[PDB]
């Protein structure tokens, strides 16, 4: 099935943020048996490999924005790789790597399917612009580079002149928010972007969240969905090995509910599994707990259901 | 005392339905934790019937892959007789396990007295593998297949199960908490049209709506006896770690108590099973006491213990 | 904003219960950066300091009820202190301290706003009377002294002659209940007090629980809201450093939801943060986890929102 036809892309990149180890995300995800598990789940899996992110000397900061040229380039390569996966009729599965990579993954998916909708699962909005940022870390800015409404608000940042804003404010839905900067909250509110912060999740229940999310995105007619999954969207009791963890997060169950629901639309077209950093587990057990959760989430995106699965044969004869 | 709180305790120290030793020590640790005395503090009329003496079968050869077939079959045979006895005395049978294979007997025996019973099966697993579909060969993952009338023809003649006569239809069983269902089992679940609430349905609806829909489904037409078969692995292993087949993403302590509190409120609980408590499977003694304390909290809630409080029919302000 | 105009009262008092260390709740709550964190979120914060509760050495039990004069005098002083804070047009924030202090906090607050409505977040009903109690600890009795319907059922306890019942049974709502004594259950049910035990929270979800809570207390008419928060209302995995923990509690998320919803009424008028005991965790991280959770609850009462917060300026054009 097209909903189980995948193109894996390794994106070992850390320079959208300062904590070392996130570049190991694709490694520890492959080591956990992701591809073998997808194949056992009746998936058509093609491995596009791990992108070779060539190091850039003298990557001077843009104002306080760190490694602009390195971040801009990694996303540039990825956009090209994602568009290749999409032309081949595969669902793109981006193994991160920090969340700056969402610039390249969403941009490449949008060159093939410009009518896509984005579901952004995360404790953070990642919507600071190179001007509103106080950290200078680009993994906190990808949504700003992608939005149509922000065109003219993004300065000419070295490494990013290839970026054509490809998503409108109406086409993104945030799930999981609980650590949004003042400037970010200003942007989310003035752009009227649809969002379910942890407050809305507590208020409505994940069941209603998913119902409204999907009705908002797919009400009119069918269209491709891009799921951008920052693993910090889940509570640090499930995914501790991540660079910016925030307590009171989505549960392991809520993470499976969201992805089980997206799988059932049969419209998942692009997926990012981001911010896994195996150098940040307090114990090797915290690393394994996180990696296991990221794999579970990925498997649900491609059909693994808690109620069970079976081949269309007769199991009693 | 109220029928809702009139109980017949049956201990079932049985482990040959699965490969991990220690589950036969389940009714020992539960009794040691003060279960029978806690129920008496709750205004319960509690009669202990003792622990069933399970005999050894030395030459218990396998039926294909199916392990210890005679041991498991006779175990449940001795339990259906003891359960039918408790039900004739007008008490709620309370089966302390022991592995889930014992459900064959507990439900078989309860069905001999109240054939109109409904079953609520709280487990991470369906336990609906037939001796033919199973890939593990363990009978603790097979009880429901032996109980369903619709699987009459698909169950071979395993040594030790001759007495078994399927007593429930697919319309008379509700699963809550499913999250580790084999392909053979999922086919059986979907072909037979069994009502179920996996972790997906629990997340979607909330435990409030799960219990409203479960109870309406089973009771809504006519009032009937309830058989609750509770596999402690239905709850997440952060609450019941000391179990043979733990599965992450389970029901919480709160959902567990919510489930059992609602069943008590019906006033129709007629049979109960507290299964798969294995005290030799804790990583630490703390993990064992936690599994044991939770199993006790779940049990007490089945017989009236309410989180909002409990009081005797007296004036507490002017006694 | 008046919903962000605060008056801090430290009430370092532990004699409402037997476990030493709860009197450090104000110390440890301040040290976690509370006042600063509040000023950071645009609040106008005044600190009235910690009350000096002078020793009351001759304090014989009233039957089994321990330290009656000490608990009585502490709430009496706090009631005058809260009434002063309310007269200065500031929301009272009482940093506890054991929960017996809510006699004084609710009493003083009622002196200025007698139409107030109570929200009591707790694993316990704290409604035993000096006669129904079996522990004889006054932190488990505050509600009984404050209810008008129990006037006739409260004996003359030394240190409490100043108490006048200020709230009717209809004007209090419980959330989080899971460890209620039989006598307390008999009182709760006989008075028809509105409650949401952990069973109701599981049945409806916190969203519906907060909808019904604010409809029940604000339906007839908008009035001041007094939130009395016992940190043991939240599950011990979030607030372990407390004297009477009970498993199966409110989650960290549910605690924020309650208080975020309370903030958005713009009617929070009084707030108790009670039962933090930094001498009672298993580890120092368990102490810091409790304190941080109490701080988080506190900030959510004064407008910290998980969706985000921003000043009325153009962040794209500074
Ligand atoms: N909004 C931040 C940013 O760096 O722009 C502030 C930082 C402090 N809290 C976490 C950090 C945010 C970045 C989030 C990036 B992430 O994890 O969602 O990919
Ligand atoms: N369906 C199983 C089986 O053994 O039949 C597969 C095994 C691997 N995961 C758990 C095992 C299942 C049986 C569990 C039975 B129990 O624990 O629910 O009583
Ligand atoms: N209801 C109690 C009481 O002391 O009256 C019984 C005691 C045993 N369990 C906990 C104790 C109760 C008081 C708790 C007061 B608290 O924590 O909410 O301040
Ligand atoms: Mn994030
Ligand atoms: Mn992110
Ligand atoms: Mn079972
Ligand atoms: Mn099971
Ligand atoms: Mn209290
Ligand atoms: Mn309490």
Q: Which position has the token pair 């976690």?
A: C32
Resolution (Å units): 1.8
Residue partners of A236: CB distance under 8 A and separation at least 6: A242, A245, A246, A247, A249
Residue A139 beta carbon below 6 angstroms from any ligand 1 atom: yes
Q: Chain B 114-173, CB below 8 Å of chain C: which residues?
A: none
Chain A residue numbers with beta carbons less than 8 Å from the beta carbon of C254 are 202
Helices C284-301 and C252-263, interaxial angle, to 10°?
20
B101: CA distance to ligand 2 center in Å? 11
Q: Look at residues A124, A302, A93, A121 and name the one whose alpha carbon lies nearest to residue A206.
A: A121
Distance CA C227, CA C270 (A): 6
Q: Is A126 annotated as a binding residue?
A: yes
Q: How many folded domains does chain B comprise?
A: 1
Residues 6+ apart with CB under 8 A from C282: C240
Shortest CA gap C307–chain A (Å)? 5
DSSP string, A18-47: S-TTGGGHHHHHHHTTHHHHHHHTT-EEEE
Helix ranges (DSSP H) in chain B: 26-32, 35-41, 69-88, 103-113, 143-147, 183-191, 199-205, 207-219, 253-266, 285-302
Give the H/E segment covering residue A184: helix A182-190
Question: Which of A99, A139, A140, A183 maximizes ligand 1 atoms within 8 Å of its Cβ, making it the mutation to test the pocket?
Answer: A140
Distance CA A258, CA A298 (A): 11
How many other CB atoms sit within 10 Å of the CB of residue A71?
32
DSSP code, position B56: P
Residue at token pair 């009262």: C9
| Angle at alpha carbon of residue B66, lines to B64 and B71, rounded to 5° | 125
* H or E element in which residue A258 lies: helix A252-265
Q: Residue C103 belongs to what domain range?
A: 1-318
CB A116 within 8 A of CB A223: yes
C195 touches chain B (CB under 8 A): yes
Sign for the pseudo-dihedral over CA of B225, B229, B232, B235: negative
For residue B121, which ligand has an atom nearest its CA? 6
Q: How large is the angle between the packed helices B207-219 and B253-266, nearest 10 degrees?
A: 30
- The catalytic site residues of C sit at 99, 122, 124, 126, 139, 230, 232, 275
Round to whole Å and give the CA distance between C73 and C69.
6
Structure tokens at A195: 């969002």
C244 labeled binding residue: yes
User: Probe ligand 1: pick from A126, A145, A249, max atoms within 8 Å of CB?
Assistant: A126
Is the CB of A272 within 6 Å of ligand 1?
A: no
**How far is Cα A128 from Cα A105, in angstroms, rounded to an integer?**
18
C-alpha C182/C-alpha C164 separation (Å) is 26
Closest CA to ligand 3's atom 5: C140
Q: Whose CA is nearest to atom 14 of ligand 3?
A: C140
Interface residue A220 vs chain B (CB under 8 A):
no
The sheet with strand C44-50 has its strands ordered as: C44-50, C5-11, C91-96, C268-274, C225-230, C117-121, C172-175, C194-196
| Cα diameter, chain B | 69
Contact C9, C88 (CB under 8 A): no
* CA distance linking residue A266 with residue A301, whole number of Å: 10
SS3 content of chain B, % helix, strand, coil (to 5): 40, 15, 40
Q: Is the CB of C244 under 6 A from ligand 3?
A: yes
A24 Cβ below 6 A of ligand 1 = no
H/E stretch holding A85: helix A68-87
Best CA proximity match to B173, nearest among B98, B120, B136: B120
B258 with C189: Cβ contact below 8 A: no
Cβ–Cβ contacts within 10 Å for residue C69, how many? Answer: 19
Q: Are strands C194-196 and A268-274 parallel, antiparallel or unpaired?
A: unpaired
Phi, psi of C76 (to 5 degrees): -60, -45
Reading the block at residue B8, the tokens are 């017949």
Q: Which of A126, A171, A235, A261 is catalytic?
A: A126
Nearest-CA neighbor of C3 among C47, C42, C30, C48? C42
From the CB of residue A115, how many other CB atoms can be counted at a distance below 10 Å? 10
Distance from CA of C137 to the nearest CA of A (A): 34
The CATH number linked to B219 is 3.40.800.10
What distance in Å separates the CA atoms of residue C149 and residue C166, rounded to the nearest whole number?
10
* Nearest of A224, A150, A248, A308 to residue B189 by alpha carbon: A308
Report yes or no: A176 and A249 within 8 Å, Cβ to Cβ: yes
This structure was determined by: X-ray
Q: Please pick, among B60, B77, B127, B273, the residue that the annotation labels catalytic.
A: B127
Q: What is the C-alpha to C-alpha distance for residues B144 and B147, in angstroms, rounded to an integer?
A: 5
Here the tokens at position B230 are: 């509770």
Beta carbons of B46 and B96 less than 8 angstroms apart: no
What is the least distance, in Å, from the CA of B41 to any CA of chain A? Answer: 36
What span, in angstroms and rounded, lies between the C-alpha atoms of B53 and C234? 45
- First-last CA distance in chain A: 25
Distance (Å, whole) CA C305 – CA C314: 19
Between positions 256 and 295 of A, the ones with CB within 8 A of B are: 256-257, 260
3 state SS of B212: helix
Is residue B60 marked as binding?
no
* Distance from the alpha carbon of residue B133 to the mean position of ligand 2, in angstroms: 12
Which residue do the tokens 């959330």 mark?
Answer: C175
**CB-CB under 8 Å, C195 with B307:** no
| Chain C neighbours, 3+ Cβ pairs < 8 A | A, B
Mutate which: C203, C208, C234, C253, vs B, most B CBs within 10 A: C203
Q: How far is C207 from chain A (nearest CA, A)?
A: 4
Nearest to B316 among C132, C197, C198 (CB): C132
CB A98 within 8 A of CB A17: yes
Nearest residue of chain C to residue B254 (CA atoms): C248
Is A235 a known active-site residue? no
CA A29 to mean position of chain CA atoms: 15
Decide if C254 touches A, using CB distance below 8 A: yes
Residue C27 burial by Cβ neighbours in a 10 Å radius (0-12, 13-18, 19+):
middle
Give the C-alpha separation, A39 to A6, whole Å.
10
Report residue C25 CA to chain centroid gap: 13
* Phi, psi for A90 (deg, rounded to 5): -110, 155
């Amino acid at each position: 099935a097209k909903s189980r036809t995948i193109g894996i892309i390794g994106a070992p990149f850390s320079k959208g943020q300062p904590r070392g180890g996130v570049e190991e995300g694709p490694t520890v995800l492959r080591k956990a048996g992701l591809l073998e598990k997808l194949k056992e789940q009746e998936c058509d899996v093609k491995d596009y490999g791990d992108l070779p992110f060539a190091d850039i000397p003298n990557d001077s900061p843009f104002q306080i924005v760190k490694n602009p040229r390195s971040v801009g380039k990694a996303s540039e390569q990825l956009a090209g790789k994602v568009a290749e996966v999409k032309k081949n009729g595969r669902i793109s599965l981006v193994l991160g790597g920090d969340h700056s990579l969402a610039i390249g993954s969403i941009s490449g998916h949008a060159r093939v399917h410009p009518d896509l909708g984005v579901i952004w699962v995360d404790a953070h909005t990642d919507i600071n612009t190179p001007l509103t940022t106080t950290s200078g870390n680009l993994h906190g800015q990808p949504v700003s580079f992608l939005l149509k409404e922000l065109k003219g608000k993004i300065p000419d940042v070295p490494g990013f002149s290839w970026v054509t804003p490809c998503i409108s404010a109406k086409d993104i839905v945030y799930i999981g928010l609980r650590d949004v900067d003042p400037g970010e909250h200003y942007i989310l509110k003035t752009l009227g972007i649809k969002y379910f912060s942890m407050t809305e999740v507590d208020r409505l229940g994940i069941g209603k969240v998913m119902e409204e999310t999907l009705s908002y995105l797919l009400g009119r007619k069918k269209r491709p969905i891009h799921l951008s999954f920052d693993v910090d969207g889940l509570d640090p009791s499930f995914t501790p090995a991540t660079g910016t963890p925030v307590v009171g997060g989505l549960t392991y169950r809520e993470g499976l509910y969201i992805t089980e629901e997206i799988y059932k639309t049969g419209l998942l077209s692009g997926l990012d599994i981001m911010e896994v950093n195996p150098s940040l587990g307090k114990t090797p057990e915290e690393v394994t707990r996180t990696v296991n959760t990221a794999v579970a989430i990925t498997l649900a995106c491609f059909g693994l259901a808690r109620e069970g699965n079976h081949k269309p044969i007769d199991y009693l004869n």
